[PDB]
Design a protein around this ligand. Structure first.
Ligand SMILES: Nc1ncnc2c1ncn2[C@@H]1O[C@H](COP(=O)(O)OP(=O)(O)O)[C@@H](O)[C@H]1O
Ligand SMILES: Nc1ncnc2c1ncn2[C@@H]1O[C@H](COP(=O)(O)OP(=O)(O)O)[C@@H](O)[C@H]1O
Ligand SMILES: [Mg+2]
Ligand SMILES: [Mg+2]
Ligand SMILES: [Mg+2]
Ligand SMILES: [Mg+2]
Lengths: 279, 287
Protein backbone atom coordinates (compact mmCIF):
# COMPACT_ATOMS: atom_id res chain seq x y z
CA UNK A 1 0.00 0.00 0.00
CA UNK A 2 1.76 3.10 -1.30
CA UNK A 3 0.33 6.52 -2.15
CA UNK A 4 0.58 7.03 -5.91
CA UNK A 5 -1.11 10.46 -6.19
CA UNK A 6 -0.79 13.64 -4.15
CA UNK A 7 -3.60 16.09 -4.82
CA UNK A 8 -3.76 19.59 -3.34
CA UNK A 9 -7.06 21.40 -3.78
CA UNK A 10 -10.21 22.72 -2.13
CA UNK A 11 -12.63 20.93 0.13
CA UNK A 12 -16.39 21.40 0.55
CA UNK A 13 -18.45 19.64 3.22
CA UNK A 14 -21.47 19.48 0.93
CA UNK A 15 -21.43 19.10 -2.82
CA UNK A 16 -18.66 18.37 -5.28
CA UNK A 17 -15.69 20.47 -6.24
CA UNK A 18 -11.95 20.16 -5.96
CA UNK A 19 -10.55 17.46 -3.74
CA UNK A 20 -14.03 16.18 -2.95
CA UNK A 21 -14.43 15.30 -6.66
CA UNK A 22 -10.90 13.93 -6.54
CA UNK A 23 -11.70 11.65 -3.62
CA UNK A 24 -14.84 10.30 -5.22
CA UNK A 25 -13.18 9.63 -8.57
CA UNK A 26 -9.75 8.33 -7.40
CA UNK A 27 -11.43 6.19 -4.71
CA UNK A 28 -13.76 4.68 -7.35
CA UNK A 29 -10.72 3.91 -9.60
CA UNK A 30 -8.94 2.46 -6.51
CA UNK A 31 -5.94 4.75 -6.94
CA UNK A 32 -4.38 5.28 -3.52
CA UNK A 33 -4.02 9.04 -3.03
CA UNK A 34 -3.15 11.76 -0.52
CA UNK A 35 -5.73 14.58 -0.35
CA UNK A 36 -4.24 17.75 1.12
CA UNK A 37 -6.93 20.39 1.54
CA UNK A 38 -6.53 24.10 0.73
CA UNK A 39 -9.91 25.03 2.20
CA UNK A 40 -12.55 23.76 4.55
CA UNK A 41 -15.78 25.27 3.30
CA UNK A 42 -19.41 24.39 3.88
CA UNK A 43 -20.22 24.53 0.15
CA UNK A 44 -18.85 25.88 -3.10
CA UNK A 45 -18.37 29.56 -4.00
CA UNK A 46 -21.48 29.57 -6.24
CA UNK A 47 -23.77 29.86 -3.20
CA UNK A 48 -24.70 33.24 -1.58
CA UNK A 49 -22.84 32.38 1.66
CA UNK A 50 -19.69 30.30 1.80
CA UNK A 51 -18.89 29.40 5.41
CA UNK A 52 -15.49 28.21 6.57
CA UNK A 53 -11.90 29.25 5.92
CA UNK A 54 -8.93 28.80 3.71
CA UNK A 55 -6.21 26.59 5.06
CA UNK A 56 -3.48 28.65 6.75
CA UNK A 57 0.07 28.49 5.45
CA UNK A 58 1.52 27.22 8.72
CA UNK A 59 -0.94 24.30 8.78
CA UNK A 60 -0.22 23.51 5.15
CA UNK A 61 3.54 23.44 5.89
CA UNK A 62 2.95 21.30 8.96
CA UNK A 63 0.97 18.81 6.88
CA UNK A 64 3.45 18.68 4.02
CA UNK A 65 6.35 18.25 6.47
CA UNK A 66 4.52 15.45 8.23
CA UNK A 67 3.87 13.58 4.95
CA UNK A 68 7.57 13.86 4.07
CA UNK A 69 8.98 12.87 7.50
CA UNK A 70 6.65 9.88 7.76
CA UNK A 71 7.64 8.79 4.20
CA UNK A 72 4.01 8.86 3.05
CA UNK A 73 4.86 10.76 -0.15
CA UNK A 74 8.04 8.87 -1.14
CA UNK A 75 6.37 6.86 -3.92
CA UNK A 76 4.22 9.63 -5.51
CA UNK A 77 4.14 9.31 -9.34
CA UNK A 78 1.38 11.84 -9.99
CA UNK A 79 0.67 15.32 -8.65
CA UNK A 80 -2.50 17.36 -9.03
CA UNK A 81 -3.09 20.91 -7.90
CA UNK A 82 -6.44 22.69 -7.97
CA UNK A 83 -7.96 25.56 -6.10
CA UNK A 84 -5.92 27.79 -3.84
CA UNK A 85 -7.50 30.55 -1.65
CA UNK A 86 -4.28 32.57 -1.29
CA UNK A 87 -0.97 33.06 -3.08
CA UNK A 88 1.20 32.06 -0.09
CA UNK A 89 -0.01 28.45 -0.48
CA UNK A 90 0.74 28.58 -4.20
CA UNK A 91 4.34 29.72 -3.68
CA UNK A 92 4.87 27.05 -0.99
CA UNK A 93 3.40 24.41 -3.32
CA UNK A 94 5.97 25.50 -5.96
CA UNK A 95 8.74 24.73 -3.43
CA UNK A 96 7.16 21.31 -2.73
CA UNK A 97 6.69 20.50 -6.41
CA UNK A 98 10.34 21.22 -7.14
CA UNK A 99 11.37 18.91 -4.29
CA UNK A 100 8.94 16.09 -5.33
CA UNK A 101 10.25 16.21 -8.93
CA UNK A 102 13.96 16.15 -7.89
CA UNK A 103 14.25 12.44 -6.87
CA UNK A 104 11.81 10.79 -9.29
CA UNK A 105 9.70 11.28 -12.39
CA UNK A 106 6.39 12.82 -11.26
CA UNK A 107 3.63 13.71 -13.74
CA UNK A 108 2.15 17.06 -12.59
CA UNK A 109 -1.32 18.00 -13.81
CA UNK A 110 -1.94 21.61 -12.79
CA UNK A 111 -5.60 22.54 -12.94
CA UNK A 112 -5.68 26.32 -12.52
CA UNK A 113 -8.88 27.40 -10.85
CA UNK A 114 -9.37 31.08 -11.37
CA UNK A 115 -12.77 31.76 -12.93
CA UNK A 116 -15.33 31.23 -15.63
CA UNK A 117 -17.57 33.18 -18.00
CA UNK A 118 -14.94 35.94 -18.17
CA UNK A 119 -15.06 36.59 -14.40
CA UNK A 120 -12.55 35.87 -11.66
CA UNK A 121 -13.87 33.73 -8.84
CA UNK A 122 -10.63 33.57 -6.90
CA UNK A 123 -8.93 36.18 -4.82
CA UNK A 124 -7.05 38.29 -7.22
CA UNK A 125 -3.67 37.62 -5.69
CA UNK A 126 -3.71 34.08 -6.80
CA UNK A 127 -3.47 34.82 -10.52
CA UNK A 128 0.14 35.94 -10.57
CA UNK A 129 1.25 33.06 -8.36
CA UNK A 130 -0.57 30.60 -10.64
CA UNK A 131 1.33 31.98 -13.66
CA UNK A 132 4.45 30.71 -11.88
CA UNK A 133 3.03 27.35 -10.75
CA UNK A 134 1.94 26.36 -14.26
CA UNK A 135 5.56 26.52 -15.44
CA UNK A 136 6.31 23.29 -13.51
CA UNK A 137 3.36 21.32 -14.95
CA UNK A 138 3.49 18.48 -17.45
CA UNK A 139 -0.08 19.29 -18.45
CA UNK A 140 -2.50 22.08 -17.54
CA UNK A 141 -6.32 21.99 -17.77
CA UNK A 142 -7.79 25.54 -17.80
CA UNK A 143 -11.11 26.60 -19.25
CA UNK A 144 -11.01 29.48 -21.78
CA UNK A 145 -11.42 32.14 -19.11
CA UNK A 146 -8.54 30.72 -17.08
CA UNK A 147 -6.34 30.58 -20.21
CA UNK A 148 -7.16 34.25 -20.76
CA UNK A 149 -6.18 35.14 -17.19
CA UNK A 150 -2.90 33.20 -17.42
CA UNK A 151 -1.85 35.00 -20.65
CA UNK A 152 -3.66 38.38 -20.75
CA UNK A 153 -5.21 37.45 -24.12
CA UNK A 154 -8.88 37.34 -24.94
CA UNK A 155 -9.89 33.74 -25.63
CA UNK A 156 -13.20 33.78 -27.49
CA UNK A 157 -12.44 31.21 -30.18
CA UNK A 158 -10.19 28.29 -31.01
CA UNK A 159 -7.78 30.51 -32.95
CA UNK A 160 -7.44 32.83 -29.97
CA UNK A 161 -6.93 29.78 -27.71
CA UNK A 162 -4.17 28.53 -30.03
CA UNK A 163 -2.36 31.87 -29.77
CA UNK A 164 -2.69 31.97 -26.00
CA UNK A 165 -1.44 28.34 -25.73
CA UNK A 166 1.65 29.28 -27.75
CA UNK A 167 2.60 31.87 -25.10
CA UNK A 168 2.49 29.19 -22.44
CA UNK A 169 4.30 26.58 -24.58
CA UNK A 170 7.09 29.12 -25.09
CA UNK A 171 7.44 29.22 -21.27
CA UNK A 172 8.01 25.44 -21.40
CA UNK A 173 4.54 23.96 -20.69
CA UNK A 174 4.36 20.77 -22.77
CA UNK A 175 0.59 20.19 -22.99
CA UNK A 176 -2.43 22.44 -22.56
CA UNK A 177 -5.95 21.04 -22.50
CA UNK A 178 -8.38 23.93 -22.88
CA UNK A 179 -11.48 22.33 -21.42
CA UNK A 180 -14.13 24.67 -22.83
CA UNK A 181 -14.31 27.29 -25.55
CA UNK A 182 -17.78 28.53 -26.58
CA UNK A 183 -18.54 28.05 -30.27
CA UNK A 184 -22.25 28.63 -30.96
CA UNK A 185 -24.23 25.99 -29.03
CA UNK A 186 -21.14 23.73 -28.79
CA UNK A 187 -18.25 23.57 -26.37
CA UNK A 188 -14.88 23.03 -28.04
CA UNK A 189 -12.09 21.36 -26.17
CA UNK A 190 -8.56 22.00 -27.52
CA UNK A 191 -5.47 19.92 -26.81
CA UNK A 192 -2.30 21.80 -27.74
CA UNK A 193 1.29 20.52 -27.69
CA UNK A 194 4.60 22.33 -27.43
CA UNK A 195 6.13 19.45 -29.43
CA UNK A 196 4.12 19.23 -32.64
CA UNK A 197 6.74 16.94 -34.26
CA UNK A 198 5.70 14.02 -32.01
CA UNK A 199 2.14 15.05 -31.08
CA UNK A 200 -0.93 16.11 -33.03
CA UNK A 201 -3.04 19.01 -31.77
CA UNK A 202 -6.75 18.24 -31.72
CA UNK A 203 -10.21 19.48 -30.89
CA UNK A 204 -13.40 17.83 -29.72
CA UNK A 205 -16.84 19.32 -30.32
CA UNK A 206 -19.34 18.74 -27.51
CA UNK A 207 -23.04 19.77 -27.82
CA UNK A 208 -23.88 22.10 -24.89
CA UNK A 209 -26.34 20.87 -22.27
CA UNK A 210 -28.38 23.78 -20.87
CA UNK A 211 -26.93 25.12 -17.56
CA UNK A 212 -23.73 26.49 -16.08
CA UNK A 213 -22.35 23.63 -13.94
CA UNK A 214 -19.87 23.71 -11.05
CA UNK A 215 -17.17 21.06 -10.43
CA UNK A 216 -17.31 19.89 -14.09
CA UNK A 217 -13.72 20.91 -14.74
CA UNK A 218 -12.58 19.23 -11.53
CA UNK A 219 -14.45 16.07 -12.47
CA UNK A 220 -12.81 16.10 -15.91
CA UNK A 221 -9.36 16.53 -14.34
CA UNK A 222 -9.70 13.49 -12.12
CA UNK A 223 -11.35 11.16 -14.64
CA UNK A 224 -8.67 12.14 -17.15
CA UNK A 225 -5.86 11.61 -14.65
CA UNK A 226 -7.29 8.27 -13.56
CA UNK A 227 -7.20 6.95 -17.13
CA UNK A 228 -3.66 8.35 -17.63
CA UNK A 229 -2.69 6.49 -14.45
CA UNK A 230 -4.29 3.28 -15.84
CA UNK A 231 -2.07 3.57 -18.94
CA UNK A 232 -4.57 4.94 -21.48
CA UNK A 233 -3.09 7.28 -24.12
CA UNK A 234 -3.99 10.95 -23.64
CA UNK A 235 -6.37 11.19 -26.64
CA UNK A 236 -8.43 8.23 -25.39
CA UNK A 237 -8.24 9.36 -21.71
CA UNK A 238 -9.66 12.72 -22.71
CA UNK A 239 -12.43 11.18 -24.88
CA UNK A 240 -13.45 8.78 -22.08
CA UNK A 241 -13.42 11.59 -19.54
CA UNK A 242 -15.60 13.92 -21.60
CA UNK A 243 -17.94 11.04 -22.52
CA UNK A 244 -18.40 10.03 -18.88
CA UNK A 245 -19.01 13.67 -18.04
CA UNK A 246 -21.84 13.90 -20.61
CA UNK A 247 -23.43 10.93 -18.87
CA UNK A 248 -23.13 12.68 -15.46
CA UNK A 249 -24.63 15.89 -16.79
CA UNK A 250 -27.52 14.22 -18.62
CA UNK A 251 -28.33 12.61 -15.27
CA UNK A 252 -28.02 15.89 -13.26
CA UNK A 253 -31.14 17.77 -12.14
CA UNK A 254 -30.52 21.50 -11.63
CA UNK A 255 -27.12 23.22 -11.88
CA UNK A 256 -26.08 23.77 -8.20
CA UNK A 257 -24.38 20.35 -7.95
CA UNK A 258 -23.38 17.62 -10.43
CA UNK A 259 -24.83 14.14 -9.77
CA UNK A 260 -21.48 12.42 -9.24
CA UNK A 261 -22.47 10.19 -6.17
CA UNK A 262 -25.28 8.47 -8.05
CA UNK A 263 -23.02 8.14 -11.11
CA UNK A 264 -20.18 6.43 -9.23
CA UNK A 265 -20.97 3.06 -10.95
CA UNK A 266 -20.37 4.64 -14.39
CA UNK A 267 -17.12 6.55 -13.60
CA UNK A 268 -14.91 3.81 -15.07
CA UNK A 269 -16.91 3.84 -18.36
CA UNK A 270 -14.81 3.21 -21.47
CA UNK A 271 -17.19 4.66 -24.10
CA UNK A 272 -15.47 7.22 -26.34
CA UNK A 273 -18.47 9.00 -27.83
CA UNK A 274 -16.66 11.86 -29.62
CA UNK A 275 -14.54 12.34 -32.69
CA UNK A 276 -10.91 13.39 -32.26
CA UNK A 277 -10.46 16.13 -34.86
CA UNK A 278 -6.86 16.99 -35.83
CA UNK A 279 -6.15 20.63 -36.69
CA UNK B 1 -30.22 15.30 -4.98
CA UNK B 2 -30.64 15.79 -1.22
CA UNK B 3 -28.15 15.24 1.58
CA UNK B 4 -29.43 12.35 3.71
CA UNK B 5 -26.54 12.13 6.21
CA UNK B 6 -24.53 14.66 8.19
CA UNK B 7 -21.31 13.35 9.65
CA UNK B 8 -18.99 15.31 11.88
CA UNK B 9 -15.61 13.73 12.55
CA UNK B 10 -11.86 13.88 11.96
CA UNK B 11 -9.93 14.10 8.69
CA UNK B 12 -6.53 12.76 7.59
CA UNK B 13 -4.90 13.58 4.21
CA UNK B 14 -3.27 10.16 4.00
CA UNK B 15 -4.77 6.97 5.32
CA UNK B 16 -8.16 6.12 6.73
CA UNK B 17 -9.78 7.33 9.96
CA UNK B 18 -12.90 9.24 10.89
CA UNK B 19 -14.66 11.13 8.14
CA UNK B 20 -12.20 9.79 5.54
CA UNK B 21 -13.54 6.27 6.29
CA UNK B 22 -17.01 7.80 6.18
CA UNK B 23 -16.46 9.30 2.76
CA UNK B 24 -15.14 6.08 1.26
CA UNK B 25 -17.93 3.95 2.73
CA UNK B 26 -20.94 6.28 2.24
CA UNK B 27 -19.72 7.18 -1.28
CA UNK B 28 -19.49 3.44 -2.15
CA UNK B 29 -23.09 2.92 -0.89
CA UNK B 30 -24.15 6.02 -2.88
CA UNK B 31 -25.60 7.71 0.21
CA UNK B 32 -25.39 11.47 -0.36
CA UNK B 33 -23.74 12.95 2.76
CA UNK B 34 -22.31 16.11 4.26
CA UNK B 35 -18.83 15.64 5.77
CA UNK B 36 -18.00 18.37 8.25
CA UNK B 37 -14.40 18.00 9.48
CA UNK B 38 -13.21 18.42 13.06
CA UNK B 39 -9.46 18.15 12.14
CA UNK B 40 -7.20 18.55 9.13
CA UNK B 41 -4.20 16.30 9.84
CA UNK B 42 -1.58 14.84 7.52
CA UNK B 43 -1.97 11.35 8.93
CA UNK B 44 -3.37 9.60 12.00
CA UNK B 45 -2.03 9.94 15.56
CA UNK B 46 -0.22 6.57 15.36
CA UNK B 47 2.69 8.12 13.42
CA UNK B 48 5.71 9.89 15.07
CA UNK B 49 4.77 13.27 13.56
CA UNK B 50 1.17 14.40 13.09
CA UNK B 51 1.07 17.64 11.11
CA UNK B 52 -1.96 19.93 10.91
CA UNK B 53 -4.57 21.32 13.35
CA UNK B 54 -7.95 20.82 14.94
CA UNK B 55 -10.79 22.76 13.39
CA UNK B 56 -11.47 26.04 15.25
CA UNK B 57 -14.88 26.71 16.77
CA UNK B 58 -15.51 29.87 14.72
CA UNK B 59 -14.88 28.00 11.47
CA UNK B 60 -17.11 25.12 12.56
CA UNK B 61 -19.94 27.59 13.35
CA UNK B 62 -19.40 29.37 10.05
CA UNK B 63 -19.69 26.05 8.21
CA UNK B 64 -22.82 24.92 10.07
CA UNK B 65 -24.50 28.32 9.57
CA UNK B 66 -23.68 28.22 5.83
CA UNK B 67 -25.22 24.73 5.47
CA UNK B 68 -28.39 26.00 7.16
CA UNK B 69 -28.70 29.30 5.24
CA UNK B 70 -28.12 27.56 1.88
CA UNK B 71 -30.77 24.89 2.85
CA UNK B 72 -28.26 22.05 2.38
CA UNK B 73 -29.19 20.25 5.65
CA UNK B 74 -33.00 20.48 5.45
CA UNK B 75 -33.51 16.80 4.47
CA UNK B 76 -31.01 15.12 6.86
CA UNK B 77 -32.40 11.80 8.21
CA UNK B 78 -29.19 10.51 9.80
CA UNK B 79 -26.50 12.05 11.92
CA UNK B 80 -23.08 10.67 12.87
CA UNK B 81 -20.51 12.10 15.18
CA UNK B 82 -16.99 10.83 15.68
CA UNK B 83 -13.78 12.42 16.85
CA UNK B 84 -13.62 15.86 18.42
CA UNK B 85 -10.30 17.52 19.34
CA UNK B 86 -11.88 19.92 21.86
CA UNK B 87 -14.99 20.24 24.03
CA UNK B 88 -16.14 23.55 22.48
CA UNK B 89 -16.96 21.72 19.23
CA UNK B 90 -18.85 19.07 21.18
CA UNK B 91 -21.08 21.59 22.97
CA UNK B 92 -21.73 23.41 19.68
CA UNK B 93 -22.58 20.09 18.03
CA UNK B 94 -25.11 19.44 20.83
CA UNK B 95 -26.83 22.71 19.82
CA UNK B 96 -26.87 21.66 16.16
CA UNK B 97 -28.15 18.15 17.05
CA UNK B 98 -31.03 19.53 19.05
CA UNK B 99 -31.99 21.85 16.18
CA UNK B 100 -31.71 19.08 13.55
CA UNK B 101 -33.94 16.73 15.67
CA UNK B 102 -36.62 19.44 16.29
CA UNK B 103 -38.32 19.49 12.84
CA UNK B 104 -37.93 15.88 11.73
CA UNK B 105 -37.08 12.39 12.85
CA UNK B 106 -33.29 12.08 12.68
CA UNK B 107 -31.47 8.88 13.64
CA UNK B 108 -28.27 9.87 15.50
CA UNK B 109 -25.42 7.40 15.78
CA UNK B 110 -22.86 8.79 18.22
CA UNK B 111 -19.49 7.08 17.95
CA UNK B 112 -17.58 8.36 20.98
CA UNK B 113 -13.85 8.44 20.17
CA UNK B 114 -11.98 8.71 23.41
CA UNK B 115 -9.38 5.92 23.63
CA UNK B 116 -8.52 2.25 23.60
CA UNK B 117 -6.59 -0.35 25.60
CA UNK B 118 -7.49 1.50 28.83
CA UNK B 119 -5.86 4.76 27.67
CA UNK B 120 -7.23 8.17 26.60
CA UNK B 121 -6.74 9.78 23.21
CA UNK B 122 -8.52 12.88 24.26
CA UNK B 123 -8.09 15.73 26.49
CA UNK B 124 -10.05 15.04 29.62
CA UNK B 125 -12.28 18.05 28.79
CA UNK B 126 -13.67 16.08 25.78
CA UNK B 127 -14.80 13.13 27.94
CA UNK B 128 -17.19 15.21 30.04
CA UNK B 129 -18.69 16.93 27.00
CA UNK B 130 -19.14 13.53 25.30
CA UNK B 131 -21.11 12.34 28.36
CA UNK B 132 -23.63 15.05 27.42
CA UNK B 133 -23.60 14.44 23.67
CA UNK B 134 -24.38 10.71 23.99
CA UNK B 135 -27.67 11.52 25.74
CA UNK B 136 -29.08 12.70 22.41
CA UNK B 137 -28.12 9.52 20.49
CA UNK B 138 -30.38 6.80 19.16
CA UNK B 139 -27.41 4.40 19.27
CA UNK B 140 -23.85 4.64 20.53
CA UNK B 141 -20.83 2.56 19.39
CA UNK B 142 -18.05 2.73 22.01
CA UNK B 143 -15.32 0.17 22.53
CA UNK B 144 -14.94 -1.19 26.10
CA UNK B 145 -12.46 1.53 27.08
CA UNK B 146 -14.77 4.27 25.86
CA UNK B 147 -17.71 2.72 27.74
CA UNK B 148 -15.58 2.77 30.89
CA UNK B 149 -14.69 6.46 30.38
CA UNK B 150 -18.35 7.37 29.80
CA UNK B 151 -19.54 5.66 33.02
CA UNK B 152 -16.59 5.59 35.46
CA UNK B 153 -16.92 1.78 35.70
CA UNK B 154 -14.31 -0.80 34.78
CA UNK B 155 -15.26 -2.80 31.64
CA UNK B 156 -13.14 -5.96 31.49
CA UNK B 157 -15.85 -8.48 30.68
CA UNK B 158 -19.36 -8.88 29.37
CA UNK B 159 -20.90 -8.76 32.84
CA UNK B 160 -19.05 -5.48 33.53
CA UNK B 161 -20.18 -4.11 30.17
CA UNK B 162 -23.78 -5.00 31.07
CA UNK B 163 -23.52 -3.02 34.36
CA UNK B 164 -21.99 -0.02 32.59
CA UNK B 165 -24.67 -0.13 29.82
CA UNK B 166 -27.34 0.02 32.52
CA UNK B 167 -26.03 3.40 33.70
CA UNK B 168 -26.34 4.82 30.19
CA UNK B 169 -29.72 3.24 29.44
CA UNK B 170 -31.02 4.84 32.70
CA UNK B 171 -29.97 8.22 31.15
CA UNK B 172 -32.23 7.39 28.22
CA UNK B 173 -29.81 5.91 25.59
CA UNK B 174 -31.86 3.31 23.70
CA UNK B 175 -29.10 1.16 22.14
CA UNK B 176 -25.45 0.58 23.02
CA UNK B 177 -23.21 -1.44 20.74
CA UNK B 178 -20.02 -2.23 22.67
CA UNK B 179 -17.74 -2.92 19.73
CA UNK B 180 -14.94 -4.76 21.51
CA UNK B 181 -14.55 -6.46 24.85
CA UNK B 182 -11.42 -8.63 25.35
CA UNK B 183 -12.19 -12.27 26.19
CA UNK B 184 -9.10 -14.51 25.81
CA UNK B 185 -8.05 -14.39 22.12
CA UNK B 186 -11.52 -13.31 21.07
CA UNK B 187 -13.20 -9.98 20.89
CA UNK B 188 -16.81 -9.92 22.13
CA UNK B 189 -19.27 -7.42 20.78
CA UNK B 190 -22.32 -6.70 22.95
CA UNK B 191 -25.57 -5.11 21.70
CA UNK B 192 -27.61 -3.90 24.66
CA UNK B 193 -31.12 -2.40 24.56
CA UNK B 194 -32.86 -0.14 27.09
CA UNK B 195 -36.12 -1.82 26.07
CA UNK B 196 -35.57 -5.54 26.56
CA UNK B 197 -39.31 -6.33 26.26
CA UNK B 198 -39.25 -5.54 22.51
CA UNK B 199 -35.56 -6.10 21.66
CA UNK B 200 -33.19 -8.97 22.35
CA UNK B 201 -29.70 -8.32 23.69
CA UNK B 202 -26.95 -10.24 21.94
CA UNK B 203 -23.25 -10.93 21.64
CA UNK B 204 -20.98 -11.87 18.75
CA UNK B 205 -17.64 -13.64 19.26
CA UNK B 206 -14.88 -12.53 16.85
CA UNK B 207 -11.44 -14.25 16.65
CA UNK B 208 -8.69 -11.70 17.14
CA UNK B 209 -6.46 -11.07 14.13
CA UNK B 210 -2.92 -10.14 15.22
CA UNK B 211 -2.30 -6.37 15.26
CA UNK B 212 -3.78 -3.20 16.76
CA UNK B 213 -5.51 -1.52 13.81
CA UNK B 214 -6.43 2.11 13.36
CA UNK B 215 -9.75 3.26 11.84
CA UNK B 216 -11.49 -0.07 12.45
CA UNK B 217 -14.14 1.30 14.76
CA UNK B 218 -14.77 4.13 12.34
CA UNK B 219 -15.12 1.66 9.46
CA UNK B 220 -17.58 -0.41 11.52
CA UNK B 221 -19.64 2.69 12.29
CA UNK B 222 -20.09 3.69 8.61
CA UNK B 223 -20.77 0.19 7.27
CA UNK B 224 -23.33 -0.40 10.06
CA UNK B 225 -25.00 2.98 9.39
CA UNK B 226 -25.09 2.40 5.62
CA UNK B 227 -27.03 -0.87 6.14
CA UNK B 228 -29.38 0.81 8.63
CA UNK B 229 -29.98 3.48 6.03
CA UNK B 230 -30.72 0.79 3.41
CA UNK B 231 -33.44 -0.58 5.75
CA UNK B 232 -31.62 -3.66 7.13
CA UNK B 233 -32.62 -4.66 10.70
CA UNK B 234 -29.95 -3.83 13.25
CA UNK B 235 -28.91 -7.46 13.97
CA UNK B 236 -28.26 -8.11 10.29
CA UNK B 237 -26.59 -4.67 9.78
CA UNK B 238 -24.19 -5.42 12.63
CA UNK B 239 -23.41 -8.94 11.33
CA UNK B 240 -22.77 -7.66 7.79
CA UNK B 241 -20.59 -4.86 9.12
CA UNK B 242 -18.49 -7.14 11.35
CA UNK B 243 -18.22 -9.68 8.52
CA UNK B 244 -17.08 -7.10 5.99
CA UNK B 245 -14.57 -5.77 8.53
CA UNK B 246 -13.04 -9.25 9.02
CA UNK B 247 -12.59 -9.43 5.27
CA UNK B 248 -10.83 -6.03 5.25
CA UNK B 249 -8.53 -6.99 8.11
CA UNK B 250 -7.63 -10.43 6.69
CA UNK B 251 -6.61 -8.52 3.58
CA UNK B 252 -4.62 -5.82 5.37
CA UNK B 253 -0.83 -6.16 5.35
CA UNK B 254 0.39 -3.51 7.82
CA UNK B 255 -1.22 -2.34 11.00
CA UNK B 256 -0.50 1.29 10.00
CA UNK B 257 -3.52 1.53 7.63
CA UNK B 258 -6.54 -0.69 6.86
CA UNK B 259 -6.89 -1.84 3.26
CA UNK B 260 -10.21 -0.10 2.63
CA UNK B 261 -9.49 1.28 -0.91
CA UNK B 262 -8.77 -2.17 -2.40
CA UNK B 263 -11.74 -3.55 -0.48
CA UNK B 264 -14.24 -1.02 -1.88
CA UNK B 265 -15.90 -3.78 -4.03
CA UNK B 266 -16.68 -5.82 -0.86
CA UNK B 267 -18.08 -2.95 1.24
CA UNK B 268 -21.68 -3.73 0.16
CA UNK B 269 -21.17 -7.43 0.95
CA UNK B 270 -24.19 -9.15 2.38
CA UNK B 271 -22.41 -12.17 3.93
CA UNK B 272 -23.32 -12.61 7.59
CA UNK B 273 -20.50 -14.88 8.72
CA UNK B 274 -20.97 -14.70 12.51
CA UNK B 275 -23.51 -16.11 14.85
CA UNK B 276 -25.92 -13.77 16.65
CA UNK B 277 -26.00 -15.15 20.20
CA UNK B 278 -28.92 -14.07 22.39
CA UNK B 279 -27.94 -13.68 26.00
CA UNK B 280 -29.67 -13.53 29.35
CA UNK B 281 -30.07 -9.79 30.18
CA UNK B 282 -28.78 -9.70 33.72
CA UNK B 283 -25.10 -9.18 34.46
CA UNK B 284 -24.89 -11.98 37.05
CA UNK B 285 -25.43 -14.69 34.34
CA UNK B 286 -22.08 -13.68 32.73
CA UNK B 287 -18.39 -13.24 33.00
N1 LIG C 1 -23.14 22.85 -20.15
C1 LIG C 1 -22.39 21.81 -20.54
N2 LIG C 1 -22.76 20.94 -21.50
C2 LIG C 1 -22.02 19.88 -21.89
N3 LIG C 1 -20.80 19.60 -21.37
C3 LIG C 1 -20.32 20.40 -20.39
C4 LIG C 1 -21.07 21.55 -19.92
N4 LIG C 1 -20.35 22.15 -18.97
C5 LIG C 1 -19.22 21.44 -18.85
N5 LIG C 1 -19.18 20.41 -19.69
C6 LIG C 1 -18.16 19.38 -19.83
O1 LIG C 1 -17.27 19.51 -18.73
C7 LIG C 1 -15.92 19.73 -19.16
C8 LIG C 1 -15.26 20.73 -18.25
O2 LIG C 1 -16.10 21.87 -18.13
P1 LIG C 1 -15.57 23.36 -17.99
O3 LIG C 1 -16.71 24.35 -17.88
O4 LIG C 1 -14.49 23.58 -19.03
O5 LIG C 1 -14.75 23.35 -16.59
P2 LIG C 1 -14.69 24.46 -15.46
O6 LIG C 1 -15.51 23.82 -14.31
O7 LIG C 1 -13.22 24.59 -15.16
O8 LIG C 1 -15.29 25.73 -16.00
C9 LIG C 1 -16.05 20.17 -20.61
O9 LIG C 1 -14.88 19.76 -21.32
C10 LIG C 1 -17.29 19.45 -21.06
O10 LIG C 1 -16.97 18.10 -21.41
N1 LIG D 1 -7.29 -7.14 16.06
C1 LIG D 1 -8.52 -7.40 15.56
N2 LIG D 1 -8.89 -8.61 15.10
C2 LIG D 1 -10.13 -8.86 14.60
N3 LIG D 1 -11.09 -7.92 14.53
C3 LIG D 1 -10.85 -6.66 14.96
C4 LIG D 1 -9.53 -6.32 15.52
N4 LIG D 1 -9.58 -5.02 15.86
C5 LIG D 1 -10.82 -4.58 15.55
N5 LIG D 1 -11.57 -5.55 15.02
C6 LIG D 1 -12.96 -5.50 14.51
O1 LIG D 1 -13.36 -4.15 14.30
C7 LIG D 1 -14.48 -3.81 15.12
C8 LIG D 1 -14.25 -2.47 15.75
O2 LIG D 1 -13.06 -2.57 16.50
P1 LIG D 1 -12.78 -1.77 17.83
O3 LIG D 1 -11.38 -2.07 18.26
O4 LIG D 1 -13.91 -1.99 18.80
O5 LIG D 1 -12.83 -0.25 17.28
P2 LIG D 1 -12.08 1.04 17.86
O6 LIG D 1 -11.20 0.56 18.99
O7 LIG D 1 -11.30 1.56 16.67
O8 LIG D 1 -13.18 1.92 18.37
C9 LIG D 1 -14.58 -4.92 16.16
O9 LIG D 1 -15.94 -5.10 16.59
C10 LIG D 1 -14.01 -6.09 15.44
O10 LIG D 1 -15.02 -6.70 14.64
MG1 LIG E 1 -16.99 25.99 -16.91
MG1 LIG F 1 -9.67 22.87 -15.25
MG1 LIG G 1 -10.01 -1.09 19.26
MG1 LIG H 1 -16.82 3.26 17.99
Amino acid sequence: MTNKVLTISSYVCSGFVGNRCGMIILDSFQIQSIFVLTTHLANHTGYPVVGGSGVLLNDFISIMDSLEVNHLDKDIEFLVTGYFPSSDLVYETINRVKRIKDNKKVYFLCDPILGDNGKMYTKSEVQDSMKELIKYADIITPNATELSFLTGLEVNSVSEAIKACHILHEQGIPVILVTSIKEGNDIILLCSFKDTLNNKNFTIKIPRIEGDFTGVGDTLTYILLSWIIKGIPLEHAVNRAISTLQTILRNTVGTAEINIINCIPYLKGTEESFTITYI
